[PDB]
Amino acid sequence: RPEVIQSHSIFEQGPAEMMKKKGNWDKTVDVSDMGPSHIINIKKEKRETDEETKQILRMLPKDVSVAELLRELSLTKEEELLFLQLPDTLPGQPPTQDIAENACTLADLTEGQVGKLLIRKSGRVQLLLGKVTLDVTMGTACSFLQELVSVGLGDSRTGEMTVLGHVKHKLVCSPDFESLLDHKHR
Amino acid sequence: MLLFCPGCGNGLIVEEGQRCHRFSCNTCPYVHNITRKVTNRKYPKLKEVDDVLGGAAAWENVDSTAESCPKCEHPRAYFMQLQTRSADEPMTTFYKCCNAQCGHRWR
Amino acid sequence: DDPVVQEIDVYLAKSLAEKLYLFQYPVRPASMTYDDIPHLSAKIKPK
Ligand SMILES: [Zn+2]
């Protein structure tokens, strides 16, 4: 192990560093694309950040309900699936279900038109539903894969399973409490 | 910086068993042989080098220009600067004077 | 704040009320879909 060393501090060249590093890392052997050495560019490893799964290449943005639906209808006009959440009980009542005040849910409602969805100036939204209004807001952003499937129990022995599509976004519906308080003073 | 196997979702390791190294899992047979560069690291760690040149080490670092004190100004303290912690944090400077019986040293 | 645009209506379909399921894969990025790789077998329990 050496002990007597002459230190150096006079300025040196940058491109010298660059050229030396080039010589130490630019002697590529990427041409070694043998049969056993092939990779599927789709089958690459992944960044933990699902939004940034771009660790090695080949060489979420703020959003609001009004802008999201505007994008969904103007720029593109194809079919789309959404996964939305509703309050515990809807403003209806059971349809002669014989009744505890059991909760009124979409599962216990008849088909047909049920309400209207309104976009107003300044970019806030309500679901006009009968004589009440439910506010609509964006949920938590989604990045993992979700698939919408329909399970048909065609027979007690066996059935069939068909994929419909993949979901991309979430919506949340909440009662407008201060509006209810203002209408019915207490 | 870390990678995960898309096949089963686990941390992979590097190993050599053929003509070229490869990024491999260990619970599933996924292999991705590496053939290009990556340009980021884990920022390694080695401790505080303080006295490796202590006192008056190799005099190759003799310099001409220096600042001066606002009070007294005798001819002996040429300038200095140093660094704080790591790669991507600022570098501090102190200006220090010493004849005897005080405690002067500025930042 | 008056209405601006797109007073879209809403309807309820009871055709598949007891038939729809929603699967999700926490460990799989949404950009990497499973449709390409052929499926072979599946099982389920009603209860
Ligand atoms: Zn694994």
UniProtKB/Swiss-Prot annotation, chain A:
UniProt modified residues of type Omega-N-methylarginine: 1
Post-translational modification: Sumoylation on Lys-43 can serve as a signal to mark misfolded Pol III for proteasomal degradation.
Compartments where found: Nucleus
Domain of life: Eukaryota
Chief place of localization: nucleus
GO molecular function terms attached to this record: chromatin binding; DNA binding
A single BP term in Gene Ontology: innate immune response
Any GO CC annotation of this UniProt entry: RNA polymerase III complex
Key words, A-Z: Acetylation, Antiviral defense, DNA-directed RNA polymerase, Immunity, Innate immunity, Isopeptide bond, Methylation, Nucleus, Phosphoprotein, Transcription, Ubl conjugation
Crosslink site: Glycyl lysine isopeptide (Lys-Gly) (interchain with G-Cter in SUMO2): 43, 54, 184
The keyword Amino-acid biosynthesis appears for this protein: no
Subunit record text: Component of the RNA polymerase III complex consisting of 17 subunits: a ten-subunit horseshoe-shaped catalytic core composed of POLR3A/RPC1, POLR3B/RPC2, POLR1C/RPAC1, POLR1D/RPAC2, POLR3K/RPC10, POLR2E/RPABC1, POLR2F/RPABC2, POLR2H/RPABC3, POLR2K/RPABC4 and POLR2L/RPABC5; a mobile stalk composed of two subunits POLR3H/RPC8 and CRCP/RPC9, protruding from the core and functioning primarily in transcription initiation; and additional subunits homologous to general transcription factors of the RNA polymerase II machinery, POLR3C/RPC3-POLR3F/RPC6-POLR3G/RPC7 heterotrimer required for transcription initiation and POLR3D/RPC4-POLR3E/RPC5 heterodimer involved in both transcription initiation and termination.
Function noted in UniProt: DNA-dependent RNA polymerase catalyzes the transcription of DNA into RNA using the four ribonucleoside triphosphates as substrates. Specific peripheric component of RNA polymerase III (Pol III) which synthesizes small non-coding RNAs including 5S rRNA, snRNAs, tRNAs and miRNAs from at least 500 distinct genomic loci. Assembles with POLR3E/RPC5 forming a subcomplex that binds the Pol III core. Enables recruitment of Pol III at transcription initiation site and drives transcription initiation from both type 2 and type 3 DNA promoters.
Residues shown, of full length: 99 to 398 of 398
Swiss-Prot record, chain B:
Zinc fingers, TFIIS-type class: 65-107
SUPFAM superfamilies reported for this sequence: Zinc beta-ribbon
GO biological process terms, semicolon-separated: defense response to virus; innate immune response; transcription by RNA polymerase III
InterPro entries: DNA-dir_RNA_pol-M_15_CS, Rpa12/Rpb9/Rpc10/TFS, Zn_ribbon_RPB9, Zn_ribbon_RPC11_C, Znf_TFIIS
Sequence motif Hairpin, residues: 88-89
Positions annotated to bind Zn(2+) 1: 5, 8, 25, 28
Zn finger limits (C4-type): 5-28
GO MF terms, alphabetically ordered: DNA-directed RNA polymerase activity; nucleic acid binding; zinc ion binding
Residues binding Zn(2+) 2, per UniProt: 69, 72, 98, 102
Listed PROSITE patterns: RNA_POL_M_15KD, ZF_TFIIS_1, ZF_TFIIS_2
Location(s) in or outside the cell: Nucleus
Family recorded in the similarity comment: Belongs to the archaeal RpoM/eukaryotic RPA12/RPB9/RPC11 RNA polymerase family.
Protein role: Core component of RNA polymerase III (Pol III) which synthesizes small non-coding RNAs using the four ribonucleoside triphosphates as substrates. Can mediate Pol I proofreading of the nascent RNA transcript. Anchors into the Pol III active site to constantly monitor transcription fidelity, cleaves mis-incorporated 5'-ribonucleotides and restarts the transcription process. Once Pol III reaches the poly(dT) termination signal, can induce Pol III clamp opening and transcription termination.
Related illness: Leukodystrophy, hypomyelinating, 21: An autosomal recessive neurodegenerative disorder characterized by global developmental delay, loss of motor, speech and cognitive milestones in the first decades of life, and diffuse hypomyelination of the white matter and atrophy of the cerebellum and corpus callosum observed on brain imaging. Clinical features include nystagmus, ataxia, dystonia, and spasticity. Other more variable features are feeding difficulties, poor overall growth with microcephaly, optic atrophy, and seizures. The disorder is progressive and may lead to premature death.
Name this protein carries in UniProt: DNA-directed RNA polymerase III subunit RPC10
Gene assigned in the entry: POLR3K
From Swiss-Prot, chain C:
Location(s) in or outside the cell: Nucleus
Disulfide-bond pairs as recorded: none
Origin: domain of life: Eukaryota
Binding partners and assembly: Component of the RNA polymerase III complex consisting of at least 17 subunits: a ten-subunit horseshoe-shaped catalytic core composed of POLR3A/RPC1, POLR3B/RPC2, POLR1C/RPAC1, POLR1D/RPAC2, POLR3K/RPC10, POLR2E/RPABC1, POLR2F/RPABC2, POLR2H/RPABC3, POLR2K/RPABC4 and POLR2L/RPABC5; the stalk composed of two subunits POLR3H/RPC8 and CRCP/RPC9, forming a structural mobile part that protrudes out of the core and functions primarily in transcription initiation; and additional subunits homologous to general transcription factors of the RNA polymerase II machinery, POLR3D/RPC4-POLR3E/RPC5 heterodimer and POLR3/CRPC3-POLR3F/RPC6-POLR3G/RPC7 heterotrimer.
Function of the molecule: DNA-dependent RNA polymerase catalyzes the transcription of DNA into RNA using the four ribonucleoside triphosphates as substrates. Specific peripheric component of RNA polymerase III (Pol III) which synthesizes small non-coding RNAs including 5S rRNA, snRNAs, tRNAs and miRNAs from at least 500 distinct genomic loci. Assembles with POLR3D/RPC4 forming a subcomplex that binds the Pol III core. Enables recruitment of Pol III at transcription initiation site and drives transcription initiation from both type 2 and type 3 DNA promoters.
Protein name: DNA-directed RNA polymerase III subunit RPC5
Organism encoding this protein: Homo sapiens
